Design a protein around this ligand. Sequence first.
Ligand SMILES: *C(=O)[C@H]([C@@H](C)O)[C@H]1CC(SCCNC=N)=C(C(=O)O)N1
Ligand code: NA
Length: 267
Amino acid sequence: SEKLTFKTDLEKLEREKAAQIGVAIVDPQGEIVAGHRMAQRFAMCSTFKFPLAALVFERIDSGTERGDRKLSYGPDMIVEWSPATERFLASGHMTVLEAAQAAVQLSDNGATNLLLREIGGPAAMTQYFRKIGDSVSRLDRKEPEMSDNTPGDLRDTTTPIAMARTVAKVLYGGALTSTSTHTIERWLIGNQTGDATLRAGFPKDWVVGEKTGTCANGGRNDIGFFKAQERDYAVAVYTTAPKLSAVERDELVASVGQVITQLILST
Ligand SMILES: *C(=O)[C@H]([C@@H](C)O)[C@H]1CC(SCCNC=N)=C(C(=O)O)N1
Ligand code: NA
């Protein structure tokens, strides 16, 4: 059984790395292909920035937001890991689209918070999840405190299956116009932060786009999509590995990518 091999290999990683590994893979309609701990809650950390960008694109599509609107800010908006926000600080603003692209592709925290300020805060992010059919994912705080990942805390969490289904809804389920869907996919493909994680474990000919996260207390996550030839999939990987170094957590997620690949290729 290829799915048994998948389960067994993930459990071997868990045991040897002292880790918990949550995975869900779904088809474009949100039907389950495979998973592991798929309805266990994990901290979203930076992975929520992909759904945030989807919210922004939905508002742009609808006309309730403009992509080129200038969002002004001062140094108060600079928090840890805000590379683009820092570069644009002297100019005094970033546009909605510049901020969204920095949030997705650099995981820029300042840019994320700038968009959160604009779209109605964590409550509004959570409302968007509910609107697209996700009753599980919740944002409670801005960055970086939302990534605290205190054991047991249900704030700022999702499950692998809820998030994989949200990804499928955004990319394949008509949440966005064709133009906006294409743009967000290109942003995910061009992500600058995921070279050593999930996509490092996929075949080089698969089209892959993803959004990473790193949380306190050993969280390392990666969510997105892959196209294996003509077949499209949405995937969410959430891991917790307190005893590993940062490099080893990257490698753990890449290893999960290889386990996913073995399943897809062999089935
Ligand atoms: C998201 O999970 C965190 C945010 C909560 O601070 C950011 C930080 C990182 S990695 C830290 C250094 N970044 C780049 N060199 C990520 C990430 O996407 O892995 N998101
Ligand atoms: Na300020």
